[PDB]
Amino acid sequence: TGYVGLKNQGATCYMNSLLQTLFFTNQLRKAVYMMPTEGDDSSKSVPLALQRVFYELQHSDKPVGTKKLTKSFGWETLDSFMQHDVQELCRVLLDNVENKMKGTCVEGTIPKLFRGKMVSYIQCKEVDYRSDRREDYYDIQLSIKGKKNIFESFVDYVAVEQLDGDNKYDAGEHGLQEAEKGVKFLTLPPVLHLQLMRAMIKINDRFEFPEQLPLDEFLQKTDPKDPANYILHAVLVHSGDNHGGHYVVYLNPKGDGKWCKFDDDVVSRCTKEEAIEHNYGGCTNAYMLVYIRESKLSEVLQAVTDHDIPQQLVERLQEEKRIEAQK
Ligand SMILES: Cn1ccc2c(=O)n(CC3(O)CCN(C(=O)[C@@H]4CCN(Cc5ccc(-c6cncnc6)s5)C[C@H]4c4ccccc4)CC3)cnc21
Q: What spacing in Å lies between the alpha carbon of 197 and ligand 1's midpoint? A: 9
Q: Containing domain of residue 74, as a range?
A: 15-322
Residue 10 placed within a domain? no
Residue 29 placed within a domain? yes
Other C-beta atoms closer than 10 Å to the C-beta of 176 total 12
Helix residue ranges per DSSP H, the chain: 15-23, 26-34, 46-59, 67-73, 86-100, 109-114, 150-157, 272-275, 297-300, 311-322
Ligand 1 pocket, residue 82 CB under 6 Å: yes
Number of domains in the chain: 1
Cα gap 153→160, rounded to integer Å: 13
Residue 168 placed within a domain? yes
Half-sphere exposure of residue 216: CA atoms within 13 angstroms, side-chain side: 11
Cα gap 112→140, rounded to integer Å: 16
Cα gap 20→39, rounded to integer Å: 27
**Residue 24's domain is classified under what CATH number?**
3.90.70.10
Instruction: Establish whether 124 is a catalytic residue.
Output: no
Q: Strand, helix or coil at 133? A: strand
Instruction: Establish whether 278 is a catalytic residue.
Output: no
Resolution (A): 2.7
Residue 6 placed within a domain? no
Other C-beta atoms closer than 10 Å to the C-beta of 185 total 19
Residues 238/180, Cβ–Cβ less than 8 Å: no
Q: What spacing in Å lies between the alpha carbon of 199 and ligand 1's midpoint? A: 6
Q: How far is CA 169 from CA 94, 166, 251, in A?
A: 36, 10, 45
Alpha carbon nearest to ligand 1 atom 36, residue:
238
Residue 7 placed within a domain? no
Method underlying the structure: X-ray
DSSP characters for 261-306?
A: EEETTEEEE--HHHHTGGGS---EEEEEEEEEETTTHHHHT----S
Alpha carbon nearest to ligand 1 atom 44, residue:
85
> 327: Cβ–Cβ under 8 A, 6 or more apart, which residues?
none
Residue 1 placed within a domain? no
Residue 3 placed within a domain? no
Q: What is the largest CA-CA distance in the chain?
A: 79
**Best CA proximity match to 154, nearest among 123, 188, 180:** 188
